[PDB]
Every structure is written in C-alpha cells, then in structure tokens.
Symmetry: D2
C-alpha cells in the first residue's frame, strides 16, 4: 500500500474534460467509501489520509480522491463555487466507476464538498463523516476570518516558506508535528506555477454570484442520513462553535470532540478517528 | 446474569454503618469498572444499566452500585451534600473490595458522584465516562430549574402516578419507552415510606452549608484522567449547553453527542453507548 | 391616550378583503415607528405595549398594529405561513398610509413578522428592535418544542383557565405580574370562538409547504439595517441560545440581555426597554 | 479638563510603599465612580478613557486610576496574581479617600481588577460596568491563547514598533483608529525600561501559586450587585464566548453586545458606551 501502487486516474466531464487523480485500496471489500481531503497549500489525498487509508482498507473499498485544484488532479485557472465544482467532478467519477450510494468522509474543505455533494445528489451519498468541515460550519462566536484563514490568506498573498510554516502551525495542537521535512514538502508542491494557478482560481471563485451554495449551514436540515461530525477542541481554522448549527439542524447528527487536538483530527487522533469511522460506517 | 445472581451487599462506615446494595458480574475479568446510576424516583442500578451490564461484563469486572438513598441501599433520613456523601460510601466499598484505581461510569446524579469521587480521592479513580452528568454541568442558556427538574420537584411535592409519568416522559426522546409497566414499577418503588424518607433527606440536603461541593464545574479543571462526556442532544434535564464548561476546562476531555436521544443515553442508544464505553475504557 | 381614542381601522388586500385594527398616537411627531405585538392567546397591540405606547409617543409617530388573528383584526380560519401572511397585510397598510422606510419594533411572534417584512420588502423597513423574536431565532441547545411552546400547545387542545394561567406563568420571571385580573381578562378574549379559530389556524399553518419562509435565521445575513435584539435571560419560550445565529449573521446587529427577565421584556423591564428603544431609534 | 489638571497621586501600602497615579474630575458631583483601564503595553487611564472622562464627569465624581505597572503608578519588577495585587492597591486608595460602596467601571484587565476587588471587599463595590473583562471571562469555544493574547506575547519577547502596531490592530474592528501617531505615542511609553520591566512582571505572575485567584468565573455567582457586561462582537482578545459563564451565574447581570466593534468598546462605540454607562449607574 503506497502512493504508487494505489494511484489511478479518470477523466470526467465538468464543462469539458477534467482529470481526477485518486488512490484505490481494499478492492476485495464490499462497502465502498470515499475520502475527501482538506484544502491547505500542497494538500492531497495521500498526505492527508496516510495514517488512515491502510486501516480503513482492511474493512472497506477505499477511494481517496484528489479534488480539482489539488494533488495530481487538474488545476484549472477558472471555476465556480468550489464545493459545487468538486461535487460535480465526484458525480462524474461515481458514474464512471458505477458506484451507487456511497458514504463520504471529508475533512475541512472536502467535508464541504461531501456536504455539497449530499445535498445535490441525495440518492448518491450515504452516511457522512465530517472532520472540522467548511461550508456547514458557521462560527457563532469567533470573529471571521479566523486565525487559520488569515494565515492561509497571507500565504496566498506572499507564498514564502515562513508564511507556510506559520499556517501549518495553527493546524495542530502538537506543534512538533510540524517538521522541516513536512514544510519543505508542502512548500514544493504549493509553489509550482500550476498550484499558484489553482490558488488564484480559488480566490476569484469567492467573488462569484453563486456564493450562497457555499453557505451549506442554511441547507443541512435536509440531510436524511446519519452524519458524524468530528472536531478538535483546539481547532483554529474552523473553531468548535462552528458545529452548533449543523448539530442542531441535521436530524440524525452525532458530534465527537477530542480535547488536545487541532484542525487535523485524522492525524493527531488517527487511531480514535479510525475506529469511530469504521464503527460509524458499519464495521465492514 | 439476573438481578438475583448478581446481587451483593457490603457494610461501609459513613458516620456509622451504611448498607450498600450492588450487582457484581464478569468476575473472571481483569479490569474493574464501577457503574453509578441516575437519580430518578425508583431508580436503581439494575433498571438503569440493564441494556449495558451483560455487554460490559464480557470485557470487564463490573460493579454497579445502588447509591445510598436508592435501590436496596440504606435510605437514611439525613445526610450532607449528596455527591460527597455517596462518594464517601464508594470510598468505603473500594477499600473493602481491595480496589485500587478504577474507572467510573456514571449517568446524571451518579455522574456527579463519579466526579465528586474523582476530585476527593484522585488516586482511586481512573478514566471517567459521564452521561448527562449533574454537578459538573452548568446550563449556560437554559433557565434553571429546567423542565425535567421542575417535573421531578412536582413529584416530590405530590407523589402521584400522573406526576411520575410526566417526569419519565421528559427523560427520553422516544416516549414509547414510557410503558405502563415501567411507570407502575417505578411508582411502586418510589412511593414506599423509606423512599419518601430518602426524598426528604435529599431535599433537606440542598439547604446545607456544603452546597459548594455540588458545583463541581468550578473544580473539574483539576481532573488529570481522560473523561468521556456523553450527551443526548434532546436532554431536557441536563441540557447540552451544560457540557461546555467541563469540555473546556477538563484537559483530556472528549464529548460525544447523539441526536434523537434524551436524558437516558445508555437506554435510547444502548449499543452505541456500550461500544464507546468499551473502547474508551481500553477494550478489556 | 386610551384604547378608543387611538383606535383606527384599515382594509387591505391579502387574497381578498382583510380588516386590520391598529392604534395611532403621537401624530404630531416627526418619525414613524410600527409596533408589532407578541402572540399569546388573547394578545393584542394595546395589551402588549401598554407600559410602552405613551412613553414612545412623546418621541415618535406610533402605529401599533393588531396582527391578523389578534385583537380586532380579521381572524380568518385558514392562512399560509403566518409571518409572511402578516407581512403581506403590513405591506398593504404601508401603501395605504404612504409610508416610506419605517423602523419596526416587534415582540416575539411580531418580531418574526417584522423580520419577515424586512426580508420581503427591503426598501420598506429601517432599524429593527426585536424582543425575543420567533422566526430568526433558532434554539441551538434547547430541545424543541420549548417549555413555553408546550404550554401554548396544551392550551390549544384544552383551552381552560388553568391552562392559560400556566402559559402566562412561563412568560415572566416575576410571576406576581400574572394577576387573576390579567388571567381573567386574557381568558375572556382567548376563549371566544373567533379567537380559538385563529389559534387552530396558526397551528395548521405549520404543516404548510411554505414552512421555509419561517426559518428566517437562514436569511437575516441579507439585512443591511442596524438591528437591536433584546432578550430576557430566563425566557422559556424563545430561549437565549436562539439569538446566536442572528447576532452573528446580521452585520449591524446589537444584543441586549436582561437577567431576571422572561419572555415579556417590554413589560418586566418596561423602563429599560423604553429608553433602549428610544435611543436606538434616534431619539425622535 | 486635561491630564495635568486632573493628575493626583497617593501612596498606599501593599507589602511596602506603592505610588498610585490617578485622575480626578467632576468633584462637584454627588456620586463617585472608579474607572479601571485596559491593559495593553503603554496603556494608562487617560488614554483608555479619553472619549469618556469628560462626558462621565458631568454626572459623576470620576476617579480614573492607573493600575500598578501602568502610566505613572509604581512599576514593580515582581508581584503576585495581578488583579489581586491591583485590588489591594485599590483597597488602599479607598480607605485613604474615605470611600464607602462605589461603582466600578473596568475595561479588559481593569475589568478583572474591578471584579477581583468586588469579591475580596464585597462591602466596597456597588454596580459594575465591565467591557470585555479578563478574569471572569472564560473562552468556551476559542482555543487559548487567543489571537490577541498571542500578539501581546510576541511583543513581550520582541518589543518592536511593528509588533506593537500589529497588537493594536487586533484590538479594534475599524483599523483606521490605529494611526501612526497613536502607535508612535504608545511605543514611546511602552519601550521604556520601566514599562518593559512591568510587562515581564505580569508574565512571570502567571506561573504563580495564586493562579486560582485569576479564575474569577468560579466566584462571580457570589456577586449581589447589578453588573453590566459590555462586549464587542469582533473582540479578538477576550472573545464573546467568554461572557457566558458570568452572564449566567451573576444573578443581576445584563449583557450588551455591539457588532462591528472589537476589544476597545469605550473608544469604538464611545457614544453608545457613555450613554449605556451613565444610565446604568443611575443618571448621577
Ligand atoms: O409571541 C408569543 O408569545 C408566542 C408565539 C408563538 Cl407562535 C408561540 O408558539 C408561543 Cl409559545 C408564544
Ligand atoms: O486589557 C488588555 O488590553 C489586555 C490585557 C492582557 Cl493581560 C492581555 O494578555 C491582553 Cl492580549 C490584553
């Protein structure tokens, strides 16, 4: 189970050909599960879910998809509301792979994509597990933009190694996780011109007329599946107060909060996160 | 595994002899776990934990203790702050049974007793699992007394079957759980003179000078063990806003919230509650 | 300044003729303010604002409007989502009176009407003062229905005097405000066949396909005017946790909370409310 | 009404001689109010309350006290828990001036001092007005340290002008209030060796064994006076979630929140704050 052995590609149609990179594992397994990664600079499926994919693949057929704008998937210079854009791409990949209704696991940005998908194609998504998700979160107490978003914007404006490190440090409770190796690797991926293309495309997408499609906290009362919200108590990007509207309005919701954990739950609490996910998705 | 096969007694010293009733199960098992029940009228260990004891006893040596004032344990007519009183009784039973440091599972009132115990004898308590606990909860938004406490007080004033049923109905999300059999059984236990003695003793205990010992939300920042807080989103006795101070100030806390669940999590979500407990307490 | 002297009527069109009763005062004053009353059974403009109209009329041209179903306005037996229904009637009265952009003061159900009006006719509403408003509030921690709502429901099913008194008693912090005279006066008004028709009409209106129009917490981010939210800390109908979404998403919001005050802010803290309102609305 | 005309000094005893600087105004007025300033580096009574003292002195006898470590009061290099230290100095000045029970207005760090004083000398403090107070606030959703606190820390380690400007910029919603003149004036005061000694003194004071005295959210349930909490919705130092415990547990509490306002309420909303304060304190 490595990057190379699990690597796959597919071409879907979202206003034209779009190349999606993804990782496939646990192919002999019955239940199919899609993982959607968070949206930092240099973020991709493999680095996001490295402490989780092997474990989940003993029970599930795992599909960890690099979202458009990330990893080795297409980095267009223009797109609409990002979660709708990515959800369309996922709709394409589902139909291609012949998937019917499949549970979604998404953190941060990918959580928003999972949610945006589940609202746009209700019959296609089963249970959702969502770690500090964007979109359905609305910070009732934290002034926006939060510290983490501020630091991300600062990197988008001035893409230096120092700025990138500052941003990664508010991602976690244990700052020792932020090693020189991790910063160098994230920075290399993030400072390529295509990635910079993807960052401008994201920035321009915010001025879009379809901004309302990103405010998914207005819509999640319609979700009929069970939804497991997972949060780090010390999350500085999407703080804990952001969970309240979803927890209240999603009929079959559950919330799990870990203390001494930041934005990257699937890394800082990989083990507890793996079991909660396996158990919630039915054990396989 | 029945009431009768698991039944035991012990005599401890809390200002004199005090008889504690309790249930013992899974005796061949290594890890010892104490269950502390909630504090409704007619409440006891067996009816509280009936959907949980068998399952927990496959992994643990389970001790479900009837608290003084409840079940077949002593119903004194006078006592101090209840959680301290009960925690002293538990200290006595621990020493008698030769228990060292043991994890505590308590709902509602018993959660308060578990917490009061863990603060008073730090070396004696391990991990805590606490379902909608009193004591460490402080309702930041719900005006006090809450609906459930009001209905309990109304029964204490006028102990009729109708009042008892009204109280039991705000205990659960699914009201079908409130059957005529359950009301008749709770009412029979609750309307005996000894139980009525216990209710006055509880009421008089509130006027005590040691009331501060019940405000455990002022003290829980001192807990060093991991604590799992479990809550029903629709809890009408100890509402969800009551969890926030504990979740924030207890260093190694975790919170799990179930939607479509009321005050009796261990009953309405027995299965999910059993697994979370087993997993959190180390699998046995 | 009496009921009869301030009484006025107007006939507007909302799917047919509709008679609106309302009170006019301070006609010599420069600035017009519309008061929209709270929605208990037997409630009307004059009763709701009695400790308020005289004081407000020294600074403002006051129009205190009986909402359809209340006081002497038409009590239809069937209608759609109530706040949109009531806002349509209000829109009609505005055109009739040649009003431009006018500030609205709404208590409870009236608050929802005031807000619904401001969303549906953006150019017609200025500053809002809203006391424990329905509609834009969403109770993030309190389970629905709340205790106050339940009592109202009990009354709709069994409209006895005991039930009305019990409902009014969860309306206020200081229960002495609930005098037998007040109960008797409300019960006289509330038990008329016309009033009970209007009460069932409201209840059936909840099963409507236009329910989304009642969930205004999804829309108030679009409000551009300053909004003053006033809330009593011990409000058992629309609890304080209901204020968070509006406070966060309305750009020019402000919140005032009174301790030792319930749902009836304008009565229990009439003085502080009057001063807060006058100043917020520009001194007049 | 100038700095020099209102300047006064007094010498009190807190483990030795201590010189307190303070400003006195409205001496002809009936009612005495003590203002306690906020605690940035280079902060003092006159600067904190400038848009406020003149207006307040028309109604009240105003005493705006430089807290030890600030302005022209003694800047010791070592002290215990700061609010208790500052309250002891205040207690001394009260006895010196023959004050009875006096209302306190405290901003931020001053708010904590005002509160700590009211708990330690119950008979000496009346009504409190508290703007984004430290101490009784506990941030239930925001991870500590907050963004504002972090910036202050950055300055203590590296007291450059860039760092001071960055700190003042998270103090306010409208950043235009941070003029180069203001930064220059604060930096002049804040970079003196005496000011930096006082700043380190504060930091070392946190490692103290008397830390519990700083956790006033455990104690304010004992406050019997009316307390007005004033908060800015975009406060990034003591965020709005910090108000909940005090608002709930102080029996005669009230809360006012301003949208489009940061940590410096008395500056950014000077007018609304002045009127709110004057009225709350009895018109004088
Ligand atoms: O405004 C009120 O008093 C009110 C209105 C409605 Cl629709 C309601 O259900 C309740 Cl409990 C109160
Ligand atoms: O009052 C303030 O401005 C203040 C006081 C302290 Cl002790 C502090 O750490 C910060 Cl960030 C601000």
């Amino acid at each position: 189970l490595t990057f190379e052995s699990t690597s796959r590609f597919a071409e879907v149609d979202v206003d034209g050909p779009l190349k999606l990179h993804y990782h496939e594992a646990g192919v002999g397994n019955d239940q199919t599960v899609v993982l959607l990664h968070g949206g930092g600079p240099g973020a991709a499926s493999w680095t996001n879910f490295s402490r989780n994919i092997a474990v989940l693949a003993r029970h599930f057929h795992v599909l960890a998809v690099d979202q458009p704008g990330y990893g080795h998937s297409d980095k267009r210079a223009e797109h609409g509301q990002f979660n709708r854009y990515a959800a369309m791409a996922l709709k394409g990949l589902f139909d291609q792979l012949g998937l019917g209704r499949v549970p979604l696991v998404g953190n941060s940005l990918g959580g928003g994509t999972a949610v945006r998908f589940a609202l746009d194609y209700p019959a296609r998504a089963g249970r959702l597990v969502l770690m500090g998700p964007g979109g359905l979160s609305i910070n009732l107490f934290a002034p926006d933009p939060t510290e983490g978003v501020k630091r991300l914007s600062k990197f988008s404006v001035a893409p230096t190694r120092e700025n990138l490190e500052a941003f990664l440090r508010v991602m976690v409770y244990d700052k020792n996780l932020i090693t020189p190796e991790l910063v160098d690797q994230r920075f290399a991926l993030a400072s390529t011109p295509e990635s910079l293309t993807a960052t401008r495309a994201m920035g321009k997408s915010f001025a879009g007329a379809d901004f309302e499609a990103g405010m998914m906290w207005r819509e999640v009362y319609r979700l009929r599946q069970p939804v497991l919200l997972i949060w780090g108590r010390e999350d500085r990007v999407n703080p804990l107060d952001g969970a309240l509207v979803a927890l209240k309005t999603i009929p079959r919701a559950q919330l799990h909060v870990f203390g001494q954990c930041g934005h990257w739950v699937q890394v800082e609490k990989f083990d507890e996160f793996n079991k909660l996910t396996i158990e919630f998705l039915g054990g396989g």
